[PDB]
Design a protein around this nucleic acid. Structure first.
Ligand SMILES: Nc1ncnc2c1c(C#CCNC(=O)COCCO)cn2[C@H]1C[C@H](O)[C@@H](COP(=O)(O)OP(=O)(O)OP(=O)(O)O)O1
Ligand SMILES: [Mg+2]
Ligand SMILES: [Mg+2]
Ligand SMILES: [Mn+2]
Length: 757
DNA sequence: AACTGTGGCCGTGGTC
DNA sequence: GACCACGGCCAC
């Protein structure tokens, strides 16, 4: 299989490198013949002789057109012949493309900003990660000496650990009496030893947890101090550290640096993404954390080093175990997009969609539309109406079924052929007309994007059917994550239509999709209420909760299955209403906030404070105990006692202050905030002390006793000292606990006054 | 992480 | 007090 491709320049000419593993052997294939290009649409074929003469300059190098060939293409499905303009070197294209577009004989140009190595994979029909090849994998981690106030990597690496199918080991330069610890003379020899190990094992995949932003940058700084050529690459190169967005990413050439952190972060929803949290969520086993402060004290005092080495060994071990499960999931996605695992595992959803569409467009002889310029971008900044959200029938309900459309927005795109190459096309035999907004879509031929969603959706449902039949609960989660990733990808094609930077931008398409969605869900609600006697309790976009007032569970389930047969026979094309589940009881608070319990006793909660990273644990813990007392024990008096116990404890300063921490993300430069909430107030006091506040910084603060603005008396939890600081017990009662639980216990006749003291 | 999309709750600190 | 805009995170 193909692992990666890139290009190097040799005597001014590009050379593609294809990193392969075949029959257990690593190979590098070199292609010297592939040429960069873009397309020009000319006013007349005779003008090509002029265009061939246009020249540019880049760094004292004259740029010329190497050669041309005329080709038949389609633009949004309409045939058109264009000139493929070839060049000697990819950098020629940025240097000359404006001069060609400016030529009076040139109407427009296309596909002039495609990275060369990806262009090669598309045009050659090559797909990374295809085949039965078994890849060898190696995880690694590091332990460092840390002191507050120091620069990054001023202190040495203390241990380097690595794990694979054969076990886990730790390299260190102090004497630790553990069988898996290899003792070397110095930090320098420890790094050189790890390098030796990577070259001996020759792994196809290096697995880290956040190596993109910590491990490799730390190693590089230390290797710069120590004079080490850290040649982990299979071509003898050192790791290649590149900016990517607001952070960095690291390649190791000829292998795949698989950083688990970007994958996990976008696949699993956790409050924190410490390695220990991730391990426990995936495998159901605890992992102990040893903190930087303990590690430094152990190294300097020479005591309890065995515990640090064990912690370091366990980091590599669980990092290997995780990579073994998540690599095949991301390899599948890599095959579906047609790009390397390295790119796909780190890329925004927009880039995944666009790379997929560029390959498919090449397969179908379709020219890609261009990315918008600044002025077109400003023109694309109007919003449009979305899904319908019904105001819920508040309170406790029994014997609830949940019905929900299968992949609704993609199914609408498929069924009604919603696409910019079909929008208001004239002269067709058949049209579908979007409700409310009136846009017409021709049905005589499959639209570009509609024609591609079907395979995604059919793949997803195969995974879903296997998921629901999987005994192994770990394997079941992993299938869940796969089918969810395809779901979001498919839905992102709809969002792509309304994305201002999209090449296949079409706002008419996007608002037609949502308009159809609104008409389908309200029609479905009308039918189930009118013709089957249901009451719809709550509905959001494409699903709803409903019951038959006064009927038992068996009756509600039976009549819901009858309604599904009836409604699906009336729905056109790929539109299908699904049975998602039955809940013995449910409590609906507001739009987007409710909790249901199934017949096995499992509670599911949506939108409520329990699921929000930005509410205090004491409020979430209390709300969770209350929901359990209500939905599971049907015990209202108990839920009330729980609240009363909590408020009393808070009043008496008996709640641990850890449960009172509030977490809120900084999303922008501090200068750009118009409204200064508590987390920005704290952030501005830290910045004034020299702390590097950037977008993505989480502020973790606690509210101290006082009266005025909350931000005036919020401090970071780092600075909280229980001997000097009294937390604001009234704030956590009146601003956190009570609001969270009173919105629920109102339904049973309890005012806040009934829950205080 | 997200810049694939819109809808929505709710705390906060302002206005009057 | 009533009201509003901002900003975060969440449900689709
Ligand atoms: N990321 C998105 N980008 C653009 N549009 C999006 C989404 C998005 C989502 C999500 C992920 N959340 C979950 O998976 C569950 O997490 C809940 C935890 O609180 C929903 N929509 C739109 C299009 C979609 O057809 C419609 C109905 O939604 P929804 O029935 O769930 O999906 P669906 O009908 O396609 O798929 P299924 O029913 O699963 O078959 O809303
Ligand atoms: Mg839904
Ligand atoms: Mg908003
Ligand atoms: Mn759905």
């Amino acid at each position: 299989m193909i692992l990666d491709t890139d290009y190097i320049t040799e005597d001014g000419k590009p050379v593609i490198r294809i990193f392969k593993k075949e029959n257990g052997e690593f190979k590098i294939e070199y292609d010297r013949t592939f040429e960069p290009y873009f397309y020009a649409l000319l006013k007349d074929d005779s003008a090509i002789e002029e265009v061939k003469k246009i020249t540019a300059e880049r760094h004292g190098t004259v740029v010329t057109v190497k050669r041309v060939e005329k080709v038949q293409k389609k633009f949004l499905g309409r045939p058109v012949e264009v000139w493929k303009l070839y060049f000697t070197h990819p950098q020629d294209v940025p240097a000359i493309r404006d001069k060609i577009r400016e030529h009076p004989a040139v109407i427009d140009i296309y596909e002039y900003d495609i990275p060369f190595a990806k262009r090669y994979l598309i045009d050659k029909g090559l797909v990374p990660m295809e085949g039965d090849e078994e890849l060898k994998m190696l995880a690694f981690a590091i332990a460092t000496l840390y002191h507050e106030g120091e620069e990054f990597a001023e202190g040495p690496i203390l241990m380097i650990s690595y794990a694979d199918e054969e076990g886990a080991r730790v390299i260190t330069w102090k004497n630790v009496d553990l069988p898996y610890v290899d003792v070397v003379s110095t930090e320098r020899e420890m790094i050189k030893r790890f390098l030796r190990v990577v070259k001996e094992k020759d792994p196809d995949v290096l697995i880290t947890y956040n190596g993109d932003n910590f491990d490799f940058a730390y190693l590089k700084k230390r290797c710069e101090k120590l004079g080490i050529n850290f040649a982990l690459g299979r071509d003898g190169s050192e790791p290649k550290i590149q900016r990517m967005g607001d952070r960095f990413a690291v390649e190791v050439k000829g292998r795949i640096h698989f950083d688990l952190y970007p994958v996990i972060r976008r696949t699993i929803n956790l409050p924190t993404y410490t390695l220990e949290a991730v391990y426990e969520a995936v495998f159901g086993q605890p992992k102990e954390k040893v903190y930087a402060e303990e590690i430094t004290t152990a190294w300097e005092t020479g005591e309890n080093l065995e515990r640090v080495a064990r912690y370091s060994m366990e980091d590599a071990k669980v990092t290997y175990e995780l990579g073994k499960e998540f690599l095949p999931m991301e390899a599948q996605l890599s095959r579906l997009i047609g790009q390397s695992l390295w790119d796909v595992s780190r890329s925004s959803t927009g880039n995944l969609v666009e790379w997929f569409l560029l390959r498919k467009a090449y397969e179908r002889n379709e020219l890609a539309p261009n990315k918008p310029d600044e002025k077109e971008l400003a023109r694309r900044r109007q919003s449009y109406e979305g899904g319908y959200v019904k105001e819920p029938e508040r309170g406790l309900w029994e014997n609830i079924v949940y019905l929900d459309f299968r992949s609704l927005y993609p199914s609408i795109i498929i069924t009604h052929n919603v696409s910019p190459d079909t929008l208001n096309r004239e002269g067709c035999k058949e049209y579908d007309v979007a409700p409310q907004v009136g846009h017409r879509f021709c049905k005589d031929f499959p639209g570009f994007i509609p024609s591609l969603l079907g395979d995604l959706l059919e793949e997803r449902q195969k995974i879903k059917k296997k998921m629901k039949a999987t005994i192994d609960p770990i394997e079941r989660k992993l299938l869940d994550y796969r089918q969810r990733a395809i779901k979001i990808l498919a839905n992102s094609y709809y969002g792509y239509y309304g994305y201002a930077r999209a090449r296949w931008y079409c706002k008419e398409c996007a608002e037609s999709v949502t308009a159809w969605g609104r008409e389908y869900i309200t029609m479905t609600i009308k039918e189930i209420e009118e013709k089957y006697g249901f009451k719809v309790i709550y509905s959001d976009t494409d699903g709803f909760f409903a019951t038959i007032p006064g009927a038992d569970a068996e009756t509600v389930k039976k009549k819901a299955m009858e309604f599904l047969k009836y409604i699906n026979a009336k729905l056109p094309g790929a539109l299908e209403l699904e049975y998602e589940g039955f809940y013995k009881r449910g409590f609906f608070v507001t739009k987007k906030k409710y909790a249901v319990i199934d017949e096995e006793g499992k509670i599911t909660t949506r939108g409520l404070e329990i699921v929000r990273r930005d509410w205090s644990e004491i409020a979430k813990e209390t709300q969770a105990r209350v929901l359990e007392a209500l939905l599971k024990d049907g015990d209202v008096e108990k839920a009330v006692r729980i609240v009363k116990e909590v408020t009393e404890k808070l009043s008496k300063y008996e709640v641990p202050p850890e449960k009172l921490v509030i977490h809120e993300q900084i999303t922008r430069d501090l200068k750009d905030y118009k409204a200064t909430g508590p987390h920005v107030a704290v952030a501005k006091r830290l910045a004034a002390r020299g702390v590097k506040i950037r977008p993505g910084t989480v502020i973790s603060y606690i509210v101290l006793k006082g009266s005025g603005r909350i931000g005036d008396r919020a401090i970071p939890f780092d600075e909280f000292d229980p001997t000097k600081h009294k937390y604001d017990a009234e704030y956590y009662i009146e601003n956190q606990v009570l609001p969270a639980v009173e919105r629920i216990l109102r339904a049973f006749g309890y005012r806040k006054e009934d829950l205080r003291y």
